[PDB]
Tab-separated table of C-alpha atoms and ligand atoms in Angstrom:
chain	number	residue	atom	x	y	z
A	1	UNK	CA	81.995	83.207	176.846
A	2	UNK	CA	83.439	85.751	174.737
A	3	UNK	CA	84.344	85.168	171.118
A	4	UNK	CA	85.514	86.700	167.849
A	5	UNK	CA	85.591	84.870	164.425
A	6	UNK	CA	86.843	86.244	160.959
A	7	UNK	CA	85.529	84.785	157.580
A	8	UNK	CA	87.517	85.944	154.742
A	9	UNK	CA	87.898	84.989	150.948
A	10	UNK	CA	91.570	83.531	151.237
A	11	UNK	CA	92.964	84.653	147.577
A	12	UNK	CA	92.174	88.171	145.856
A	13	UNK	CA	93.200	89.509	142.735
A	14	UNK	CA	95.555	92.556	143.057
A	15	UNK	CA	93.225	95.335	142.184
A	16	UNK	CA	89.683	94.039	143.332
A	17	UNK	CA	88.351	94.309	146.669
A	18	UNK	CA	88.637	92.374	149.892
A	19	UNK	CA	85.765	92.233	152.184
A	20	UNK	CA	86.326	90.392	155.612
A	21	UNK	CA	83.470	89.643	158.297
A	22	UNK	CA	83.951	89.450	161.773
A	23	UNK	CA	80.816	87.814	163.775
A	24	UNK	CA	81.042	88.368	167.445
A	25	UNK	CA	79.756	86.264	170.434
A	26	UNK	CA	79.341	86.628	173.698
A	27	UNK	CA	78.796	90.528	173.813
A	28	UNK	CA	77.042	93.505	172.139
A	29	UNK	CA	78.066	95.737	169.438
A	30	UNK	CA	76.564	98.687	171.162
A	31	UNK	CA	78.541	98.418	173.837
A	32	UNK	CA	82.048	97.879	173.070
A	33	UNK	CA	84.332	98.837	170.056
A	34	UNK	CA	86.161	96.602	167.491
A	35	UNK	CA	89.657	97.047	166.001
A	36	UNK	CA	90.960	95.440	162.849
A	37	UNK	CA	94.695	94.505	162.967
A	38	UNK	CA	96.611	93.042	160.443
A	39	UNK	CA	100.169	91.254	160.136
A	40	UNK	CA	101.582	90.570	156.831
A	41	UNK	CA	103.714	87.504	156.670
A	42	UNK	CA	106.664	87.402	158.838
A	43	UNK	CA	106.003	91.550	160.088
A	44	UNK	CA	104.947	92.970	163.025
A	45	UNK	CA	101.581	94.083	163.490
A	46	UNK	CA	99.473	96.729	162.219
A	47	UNK	CA	96.928	98.724	163.663
A	48	UNK	CA	94.374	98.971	160.350
A	49	UNK	CA	90.951	100.687	161.695
A	50	UNK	CA	88.527	101.070	164.601
A	51	UNK	CA	84.334	101.128	164.564
A	52	UNK	CA	83.307	102.423	168.109
A	53	UNK	CA	80.264	101.075	169.757
A	54	UNK	CA	78.854	104.706	168.680
A	55	UNK	CA	79.449	103.656	165.018
A	56	UNK	CA	82.130	106.150	164.011
A	57	UNK	CA	85.571	104.764	162.582
A	58	UNK	CA	89.359	105.751	162.585
A	59	UNK	CA	91.614	104.417	160.096
A	60	UNK	CA	95.333	103.859	159.700
A	61	UNK	CA	97.373	106.702	158.279
A	62	UNK	CA	98.754	104.562	155.233
A	63	UNK	CA	95.526	102.636	154.464
A	64	UNK	CA	92.998	105.179	155.609
A	65	UNK	CA	91.849	106.097	151.507
A	66	UNK	CA	91.071	102.460	150.843
A	67	UNK	CA	89.419	101.206	153.880
A	68	UNK	CA	85.787	101.599	154.964
A	69	UNK	CA	84.568	99.894	158.361
A	70	UNK	CA	80.825	98.930	158.867
A	71	UNK	CA	78.658	97.119	161.016
A	72	UNK	CA	75.366	95.380	161.764
A	73	UNK	CA	74.514	95.549	165.200
A	74	UNK	CA	71.350	93.682	165.125
A	75	UNK	CA	73.839	90.690	163.370
A	76	UNK	CA	76.680	91.040	165.842
A	77	UNK	CA	78.790	91.321	162.413
A	78	UNK	CA	81.690	93.677	161.644
A	79	UNK	CA	82.903	94.440	158.086
A	80	UNK	CA	86.051	95.711	156.601
A	81	UNK	CA	86.040	96.517	153.003
A	82	UNK	CA	89.461	97.334	151.245
A	83	UNK	CA	89.679	99.039	147.447
A	84	UNK	CA	92.468	98.767	145.069
A	85	UNK	CA	94.206	95.925	146.679
A	86	UNK	CA	97.978	95.732	146.708
A	87	UNK	CA	100.480	92.644	146.971
A	88	UNK	CA	101.630	94.365	149.921
A	89	UNK	CA	97.965	93.930	151.627
A	90	UNK	CA	98.932	90.071	152.088
A	91	UNK	CA	98.568	89.644	155.711
A	92	UNK	CA	96.488	87.795	158.548
A	93	UNK	CA	93.522	89.993	159.592
A	94	UNK	CA	92.634	89.802	163.256
A	95	UNK	CA	89.599	91.593	164.726
A	96	UNK	CA	89.869	92.760	168.298
A	97	UNK	CA	87.601	94.136	170.938
A	98	UNK	CA	88.333	97.160	173.243
A	99	UNK	CA	88.342	96.191	176.900
A	100	UNK	CA	87.585	99.628	177.480
A	101	UNK	CA	83.803	100.062	176.373
A	102	UNK	CA	84.358	103.775	176.715
A	103	UNK	CA	85.886	106.045	173.940
A	104	UNK	CA	89.441	105.522	175.498
A	105	UNK	CA	90.397	101.485	175.428
A	106	UNK	CA	92.328	100.434	178.020
A	107	UNK	CA	93.641	97.602	175.746
A	108	UNK	CA	92.549	94.891	173.139
A	109	UNK	CA	90.354	92.256	174.827
A	110	UNK	CA	89.787	89.141	173.009
A	111	UNK	CA	90.853	88.717	169.672
A	112	UNK	CA	89.802	86.543	166.795
A	113	UNK	CA	91.719	83.469	165.368
A	114	UNK	CA	92.721	85.924	162.425
A	115	UNK	CA	92.202	85.095	158.660
A	116	UNK	CA	94.795	84.509	156.075
A	117	UNK	CA	94.173	87.002	152.820
A	118	UNK	CA	96.766	86.115	149.641
A	119	UNK	CA	96.664	89.058	147.201
A	120	UNK	CA	97.785	87.944	143.690
A	121	UNK	CA	97.186	86.763	140.195
A	122	UNK	CA	98.361	83.114	140.347
A	123	UNK	CA	95.622	80.315	140.779
A	124	UNK	CA	94.932	77.238	142.762
A	125	UNK	CA	97.842	74.895	141.996
A	126	UNK	CA	97.792	71.416	143.422
A	127	UNK	CA	101.374	70.817	144.902
A	128	UNK	CA	104.022	68.514	143.546
A	129	UNK	CA	105.519	66.038	146.382
A	130	UNK	CA	108.714	64.404	145.970
A	131	UNK	CA	110.394	61.763	148.176
A	132	UNK	CA	113.478	62.368	149.916
A	133	UNK	CA	115.374	59.268	150.408
A	134	UNK	CA	118.940	59.017	151.487
A	135	UNK	CA	121.488	58.018	148.914
A	136	UNK	CA	122.308	54.395	148.797
A	137	UNK	CA	126.045	55.413	149.689
A	138	UNK	CA	125.971	56.873	153.229
A	139	UNK	CA	124.842	54.245	155.778
A	140	UNK	CA	124.231	56.054	158.943
A	141	UNK	CA	123.630	54.247	162.391
A	142	UNK	CA	120.901	54.952	165.247
A	143	UNK	CA	118.542	57.217	163.179
A	144	UNK	CA	117.342	57.920	159.614
A	145	UNK	CA	116.099	61.392	158.420
A	146	UNK	CA	113.463	61.493	156.101
A	147	UNK	CA	111.762	64.086	153.849
A	148	UNK	CA	109.010	65.267	151.509
A	149	UNK	CA	109.714	68.364	149.317
A	150	UNK	CA	106.024	70.107	148.195
A	151	UNK	CA	107.088	71.992	145.207
A	152	UNK	CA	104.783	74.500	142.969
A	153	UNK	CA	101.598	75.042	144.881
A	154	UNK	CA	99.458	78.127	145.759
A	155	UNK	CA	97.686	79.464	147.638
A	156	UNK	CA	99.224	78.495	151.252
A	157	UNK	CA	99.205	76.306	152.939
A	158	UNK	CA	99.811	72.532	153.194
A	159	UNK	CA	99.963	70.036	155.843
A	160	UNK	CA	102.242	67.235	155.774
A	161	UNK	CA	101.251	64.369	157.921
A	162	UNK	CA	103.709	61.627	158.836
A	163	UNK	CA	102.170	57.779	159.214
A	164	UNK	CA	98.768	58.777	160.167
A	165	UNK	CA	100.213	61.318	162.670
A	166	UNK	CA	101.911	58.326	164.575
A	167	UNK	CA	105.241	60.206	163.929
A	168	UNK	CA	105.385	63.758	165.719
A	169	UNK	CA	108.746	62.168	166.716
A	170	UNK	CA	110.667	64.659	165.164
A	171	UNK	CA	108.706	66.271	162.613
A	172	UNK	CA	110.349	69.405	161.528
A	173	UNK	CA	108.043	71.614	159.125
A	174	UNK	CA	109.980	74.561	156.892
A	175	UNK	CA	108.085	77.413	156.538
A	176	UNK	CA	106.868	77.595	152.644
A	177	UNK	CA	108.854	80.287	150.264
A	178	UNK	CA	107.834	81.981	147.346
A	179	UNK	CA	109.509	80.721	144.077
A	180	UNK	CA	108.388	81.309	140.539
A	181	UNK	CA	105.083	82.393	141.710
A	182	UNK	CA	104.245	79.608	143.643
A	183	UNK	CA	105.120	77.930	147.156
A	184	UNK	CA	107.619	75.416	148.241
A	185	UNK	CA	107.983	73.899	151.473
A	186	UNK	CA	109.776	70.792	153.203
A	187	UNK	CA	109.147	68.249	156.033
A	188	UNK	CA	111.365	66.016	157.445
A	189	UNK	CA	111.091	62.990	160.096
A	190	UNK	CA	113.334	61.182	161.791
A	191	UNK	CA	112.874	57.637	162.762
A	192	UNK	CA	114.645	55.046	164.430
A	193	UNK	CA	116.882	53.726	162.039
A	194	UNK	CA	116.052	49.536	162.545
A	195	UNK	CA	112.610	50.741	161.558
A	196	UNK	CA	113.557	52.159	157.744
A	197	UNK	CA	113.386	51.221	155.301
A	198	UNK	CA	112.361	48.030	157.275
A	199	UNK	CA	108.517	49.538	158.050
A	200	UNK	CA	106.672	51.471	155.508
A	201	UNK	CA	107.079	55.588	155.997
A	202	UNK	CA	104.334	57.942	154.201
A	203	UNK	CA	104.241	61.525	154.218
A	204	UNK	CA	100.585	62.619	153.345
A	205	UNK	CA	100.509	66.143	151.678
A	206	UNK	CA	96.815	68.219	152.177
A	207	UNK	CA	96.447	71.237	149.825
A	208	UNK	CA	92.718	72.288	151.228
A	209	UNK	CA	92.207	74.888	148.643
A	210	UNK	CA	92.668	72.365	145.811
A	211	UNK	CA	91.106	69.633	147.163
A	212	UNK	CA	94.051	67.310	146.567
A	213	UNK	CA	95.881	64.714	149.236
A	214	UNK	CA	98.983	63.493	148.062
A	215	UNK	CA	100.967	60.280	149.376
A	216	UNK	CA	104.176	59.386	148.858
A	217	UNK	CA	105.699	56.070	150.072
A	218	UNK	CA	109.464	56.978	151.156
A	219	UNK	CA	111.662	54.394	149.609
A	220	UNK	CA	115.655	53.490	149.174
A	221	UNK	CA	117.104	54.253	146.225
B	1	UNK	CA	102.478	109.147	162.615
B	2	UNK	CA	103.555	108.346	165.922
B	3	UNK	CA	106.244	105.650	165.490
B	4	UNK	CA	107.220	103.049	168.476
B	5	UNK	CA	110.871	101.593	168.220
B	6	UNK	CA	111.353	98.483	170.401
B	7	UNK	CA	114.957	97.155	171.666
B	8	UNK	CA	116.499	94.629	170.870
B	9	UNK	CA	114.998	93.043	167.917
B	10	UNK	CA	115.514	89.450	169.354
B	11	UNK	CA	116.694	88.788	172.959
B	12	UNK	CA	118.254	85.671	174.109
B	13	UNK	CA	117.457	84.798	177.645
B	14	UNK	CA	118.243	81.463	180.157
B	15	UNK	CA	115.517	79.464	181.492
B	16	UNK	CA	114.362	81.008	184.768
B	17	UNK	CA	116.432	84.353	184.246
B	18	UNK	CA	115.261	87.767	183.533
B	19	UNK	CA	114.322	89.349	180.453
B	20	UNK	CA	114.148	93.148	179.845
B	21	UNK	CA	112.530	94.805	176.746
B	22	UNK	CA	112.183	98.481	175.902
B	23	UNK	CA	110.105	100.439	173.990
B	24	UNK	CA	110.421	104.391	172.776
B	25	UNK	CA	107.976	106.541	171.406
B	26	UNK	CA	109.133	109.265	168.810
B	27	UNK	CA	107.237	111.734	170.677
B	28	UNK	CA	105.763	111.915	174.102
B	29	UNK	CA	103.076	109.610	174.803
B	30	UNK	CA	101.687	111.463	177.901
B	31	UNK	CA	98.051	112.969	177.663
B	32	UNK	CA	97.953	116.346	179.515
B	33	UNK	CA	95.280	114.432	181.447
B	34	UNK	CA	98.254	112.805	183.191
B	35	UNK	CA	97.272	109.237	181.286
B	36	UNK	CA	99.170	107.361	179.279
B	37	UNK	CA	98.044	104.696	177.512
B	38	UNK	CA	100.621	102.085	176.385
B	39	UNK	CA	100.023	98.377	176.411
B	40	UNK	CA	102.138	95.379	175.927
B	41	UNK	CA	100.890	92.174	173.626
B	42	UNK	CA	102.150	88.811	173.339
B	43	UNK	CA	101.634	86.639	170.602
B	44	UNK	CA	103.136	83.204	170.777
B	45	UNK	CA	104.025	81.276	167.694
B	46	UNK	CA	100.906	80.539	165.458
B	47	UNK	CA	98.575	82.236	168.139
B	48	UNK	CA	96.623	85.666	168.366
B	49	UNK	CA	98.118	88.549	170.204
B	50	UNK	CA	97.162	88.746	174.016
B	51	UNK	CA	97.203	91.328	176.396
B	52	UNK	CA	99.698	91.332	179.000
B	53	UNK	CA	99.875	95.199	180.086
B	54	UNK	CA	97.612	97.795	179.823
B	55	UNK	CA	98.198	101.203	181.602
B	56	UNK	CA	102.230	101.112	181.466
B	57	UNK	CA	102.078	99.354	184.455
B	58	UNK	CA	98.872	97.332	184.804
B	59	UNK	CA	98.768	93.512	184.547
B	60	UNK	CA	95.858	92.231	182.406
B	61	UNK	CA	93.757	89.724	184.431
B	62	UNK	CA	95.242	85.996	184.466
B	63	UNK	CA	98.910	87.393	183.971
B	64	UNK	CA	101.281	86.504	186.434
B	65	UNK	CA	102.848	88.884	188.531
B	66	UNK	CA	106.506	87.806	186.728
B	67	UNK	CA	105.534	90.260	184.111
B	68	UNK	CA	106.072	93.770	184.673
B	69	UNK	CA	106.008	97.107	182.914
B	70	UNK	CA	107.689	100.511	183.869
B	71	UNK	CA	108.438	103.662	181.780
B	72	UNK	CA	108.278	107.655	182.143
B	73	UNK	CA	107.122	109.659	178.832
B	74	UNK	CA	108.923	108.363	175.608
B	75	UNK	CA	110.877	105.144	177.553
B	76	UNK	CA	109.199	102.082	178.786
B	77	UNK	CA	110.090	98.717	179.454
B	78	UNK	CA	108.712	95.337	180.292
B	79	UNK	CA	110.283	92.936	181.991
B	80	UNK	CA	110.007	89.406	182.433
B	81	UNK	CA	111.304	87.690	185.508
B	82	UNK	CA	111.714	83.635	185.861
B	83	UNK	CA	111.575	82.864	182.069
B	84	UNK	CA	109.598	79.732	181.100
B	85	UNK	CA	109.102	78.020	178.005
B	86	UNK	CA	105.605	79.724	177.745
B	87	UNK	CA	106.905	83.179	177.740
B	88	UNK	CA	108.191	82.455	174.055
B	89	UNK	CA	107.059	84.696	171.287
B	90	UNK	CA	106.987	88.016	169.961
B	91	UNK	CA	106.283	90.882	172.327
B	92	UNK	CA	104.830	93.954	171.251
B	93	UNK	CA	104.195	97.792	172.544
B	94	UNK	CA	101.203	99.385	171.504
B	95	UNK	CA	99.946	102.896	171.874
B	96	UNK	CA	96.372	104.051	171.513
B	97	UNK	CA	96.319	107.240	172.989
B	98	UNK	CA	97.216	109.366	170.012
B	99	UNK	CA	95.634	108.633	166.663
B	100	UNK	CA	96.367	106.478	164.856
B	101	UNK	CA	97.346	103.570	167.092
B	102	UNK	CA	100.535	102.168	166.515
B	103	UNK	CA	102.640	98.684	167.079
B	104	UNK	CA	106.459	98.573	167.790
B	105	UNK	CA	108.069	96.249	165.785
B	106	UNK	CA	108.508	93.488	168.305
B	107	UNK	CA	111.176	91.780	169.618
B	108	UNK	CA	111.350	87.876	169.417
B	109	UNK	CA	112.007	86.510	172.852
B	110	UNK	CA	114.825	83.434	172.339
B	111	UNK	CA	115.544	80.645	174.733
B	112	UNK	CA	119.583	80.578	175.352
B	113	UNK	CA	120.795	76.938	175.900
B	114	UNK	CA	124.147	75.056	175.242
B	115	UNK	CA	125.523	75.123	171.725
B	116	UNK	CA	124.333	72.331	169.644
B	117	UNK	CA	125.866	71.008	166.260
B	118	UNK	CA	123.459	70.181	163.227
B	119	UNK	CA	122.504	66.832	161.780
B	120	UNK	CA	123.272	67.133	158.211
B	121	UNK	CA	121.733	65.087	155.570
B	122	UNK	CA	121.474	65.763	151.729
B	123	UNK	CA	119.064	64.225	149.734
B	124	UNK	CA	119.357	63.730	145.832
B	125	UNK	CA	116.756	64.470	143.558
B	126	UNK	CA	113.811	62.110	143.219
B	127	UNK	CA	113.455	60.501	140.016
B	128	UNK	CA	109.794	61.532	139.611
B	129	UNK	CA	111.060	64.919	139.698
B	130	UNK	CA	113.796	64.466	136.945
B	131	UNK	CA	111.049	63.020	135.210
B	132	UNK	CA	109.530	66.585	135.160
B	133	UNK	CA	112.420	68.363	134.237
B	134	UNK	CA	113.770	70.287	137.492
B	135	UNK	CA	116.068	68.743	139.894
B	136	UNK	CA	115.903	69.846	143.735
B	137	UNK	CA	118.901	68.498	145.886
B	138	UNK	CA	117.933	69.163	149.327
B	139	UNK	CA	119.806	69.634	152.679
B	140	UNK	CA	118.413	69.377	156.087
B	141	UNK	CA	120.231	70.612	158.894
B	142	UNK	CA	118.129	69.540	162.251
B	143	UNK	CA	118.533	70.662	165.710
B	144	UNK	CA	121.103	73.295	165.960
B	145	UNK	CA	121.933	76.379	168.199
B	146	UNK	CA	122.435	79.203	167.781
B	147	UNK	CA	120.381	80.347	164.849
B	148	UNK	CA	123.367	81.865	162.888
B	149	UNK	CA	124.650	78.897	160.279
B	150	UNK	CA	126.068	78.944	157.064
B	151	UNK	CA	125.283	76.451	153.984
B	152	UNK	CA	127.611	76.316	151.315
B	153	UNK	CA	126.294	74.530	148.233
B	154	UNK	CA	129.118	72.588	145.888
B	155	UNK	CA	128.919	71.248	142.274
B	156	UNK	CA	132.101	69.050	141.682
B	157	UNK	CA	133.776	71.043	144.196
B	158	UNK	CA	132.644	74.368	142.642
B	159	UNK	CA	130.539	76.771	144.611
B	160	UNK	CA	126.987	77.437	143.876
B	161	UNK	CA	125.099	80.715	144.736
B	162	UNK	CA	122.314	80.878	142.442
B	163	UNK	CA	119.108	78.995	142.964
B	164	UNK	CA	119.622	78.401	146.776
B	165	UNK	CA	116.699	78.735	148.844
B	166	UNK	CA	116.858	78.377	152.873
B	167	UNK	CA	114.302	78.060	155.312
B	168	UNK	CA	114.755	78.223	159.020
B	169	UNK	CA	112.087	76.852	161.529
B	170	UNK	CA	111.180	78.769	164.733
B	171	UNK	CA	112.449	78.085	167.721
B	172	UNK	CA	111.504	74.324	168.939
B	173	UNK	CA	109.724	74.726	172.464
B	174	UNK	CA	110.946	71.685	173.838
B	175	UNK	CA	114.630	71.625	173.181
B	176	UNK	CA	115.051	75.033	172.105
B	177	UNK	CA	116.830	74.371	168.968
B	178	UNK	CA	116.614	75.629	165.314
B	179	UNK	CA	116.497	73.445	162.022
B	180	UNK	CA	117.074	74.729	158.488
B	181	UNK	CA	116.360	73.353	154.868
B	182	UNK	CA	118.434	74.417	152.207
B	183	UNK	CA	117.511	73.520	148.876
B	184	UNK	CA	119.556	73.508	145.805
B	185	UNK	CA	117.636	73.818	142.414
B	186	UNK	CA	118.715	73.073	138.963
B	187	UNK	CA	117.756	71.545	135.841
B	188	UNK	CA	117.613	67.907	135.307
B	189	UNK	CA	120.057	68.781	132.126
B	190	UNK	CA	122.100	70.909	134.372
B	191	UNK	CA	121.801	68.279	137.118
B	192	UNK	CA	122.954	65.514	135.286
B	193	UNK	CA	126.207	67.019	133.918
B	194	UNK	CA	127.893	66.839	136.931
B	195	UNK	CA	129.168	64.321	139.512
B	196	UNK	CA	129.164	65.402	143.459
B	197	UNK	CA	126.905	67.640	145.007
B	198	UNK	CA	127.994	68.896	148.581
B	199	UNK	CA	126.445	70.328	151.216
B	200	UNK	CA	128.657	72.188	153.630
B	201	UNK	CA	127.357	73.846	157.122
B	202	UNK	CA	129.406	76.314	158.971
B	203	UNK	CA	128.168	76.736	162.875
B	204	UNK	CA	129.971	78.398	165.551
B	205	UNK	CA	130.082	74.869	167.121
B	206	UNK	CA	132.962	74.235	165.228
B	207	UNK	CA	135.635	75.908	162.909
B	208	UNK	CA	135.628	72.622	160.649
B	209	UNK	CA	132.534	72.747	158.383
B	210	UNK	CA	129.883	69.729	158.453
B	211	UNK	CA	130.152	68.348	155.067
B	212	UNK	CA	127.539	65.932	153.347
B	213	UNK	CA	127.835	64.720	149.948
B	214	UNK	CA	126.788	62.400	147.490
B	215	UNK	CA	127.880	61.415	143.720
B	216	UNK	CA	125.015	60.754	141.025
B	217	UNK	CA	126.863	57.314	140.539
C	1	ZN	ZN1	91.220	100.266	169.122
C	2	ZN	ZN1	87.371	88.567	178.947
C	3	ZN	ZN1	93.959	113.528	175.558
C	4	ZN	ZN1	103.504	87.288	193.631
C	5	ZN	ZN1	98.690	113.452	169.945
C	6	ZN	ZN1	113.786	69.188	166.256
C	7	ZN	ZN1	130.865	69.148	136.625
C-alpha cells in the first residue's frame, strides 16, 4: 500500500523559514521522483518542484530562488525548505509521486493528504463563541435555525460540533474569513421546532491550535 | 512560463447529462518526439487531487470510461458523460513536458438543479458579545439555487455596506444547493443607537426580495 504523509509547522512568521517533511510508505525513493504542489486558500494548484529518483531537482519559475528540495533515501523522507517567506506563501502543501519511474512522468500517482501552512505575525488566539438565537419577536413553525458565531481566532481552523454529532441534520459550516488579522466563521443547524427550546441544543467549538473547547448552550432571548 | 488556460471557470451541468471542459496552452505542447504530456486532475471538496487522464487520452486505473480526454497541440478537452454526484469538484489540466510543469486555473463543476429560494433568518447580537464591546448581527440564507444572491443590510430603513462579510458554502452534495452567511459588525455604541435591523436577500427565484428583521425593543 502506497502512502505519502506531510508534516509541517502550521504557522510561520513572514520572513522566517518553512521546512516540510514528506515521509513515504510502500515504495522506494530510488525508484520514483516526488513532486511538491501547493494550493493557496481558494486558488488553483501550483506546481512547486520535483526531486527525481536520481537526486536532482527542478523548481517553479516564481519560487525558484527561495526553494530547496532535499531527500534522505534511507529514511524515506523528502524535504522542502523555503526561505524569506511571504504572506503569499500561505497554502496547503502536498507531495505527490510520479507514476512514471523514468525521467518523463506520465502523471502524479498518489498524493499526500496535504498540510496547511499559515504565514503571518498574528499569535495563537482562542476563539470567542457567541450563540445565535432567534429574537422572541418572530415565531416560525415547522423548523428552527440556530447558529454559533466563532469570532477572533487564529490560526485556522475550528470544528463546530452540534449535540455530540447527533445533529448532522442540516449543519451548515461557513468558511472562515479574515477580519482585523483574525478569523471568523459561523455554523448553523436546523432542528424541528417542537424540539427547541423544548430540548437542549449546544454547539461545541474546538480550536486544536490553542487547546480550547468552548461550549455554548443555545437559549431563547 | 508556459500558461495553460482553462474554460469555462465554472460549468453547470444536469445530473446524468454530459460535461465538457477545455484547456488551451499558450504554446504548442507536442514534443518533436510526437509525444504529448497532458494530464487531467480532479480535486473533490476537502480532498487531494487525483489523476484521471494522463496522456491526453489515457484513462488512469480505476477511472470509469465515461471520462474521456482529447485534443491536438494547443487545444484539449476533458469530457464527462452521465455526470454523477461523485463527479463534483475542480478539474485541472496539467502539462509536465515543458519545464516548469504548470496547471490550468481549474474548472468548478457545478450541478444544475431547480431554482430554490433561500430560508432566511436574522439573529441579533448575543448579550455576551455586547458585553465585549462589539455587536455582530447575523443573517443565514440557507439552501438556495443558483449561487448568485444579494444581501442588503438595513438599519432603520437605511442601507449599510461598511463592515459586511459574506461567506458561501461549497455546493451541498445531497441537495445541490448553496448556503451563505452575512454578518454586519458594528460597535455596541453604534448598535444601541438604532431600532431596526433588516436583512434583504435578492435572488432570481423572485423579483420580490426576502426580508427578515427585528427591533431591539
Ligand atoms: Zn513531476
Ligand atoms: Zn497506485
Ligand atoms: Zn522533448
Ligand atoms: Zn465502457
Ligand atoms: Zn519547451
Ligand atoms: Zn443545506
Ligand atoms: Zn437610527
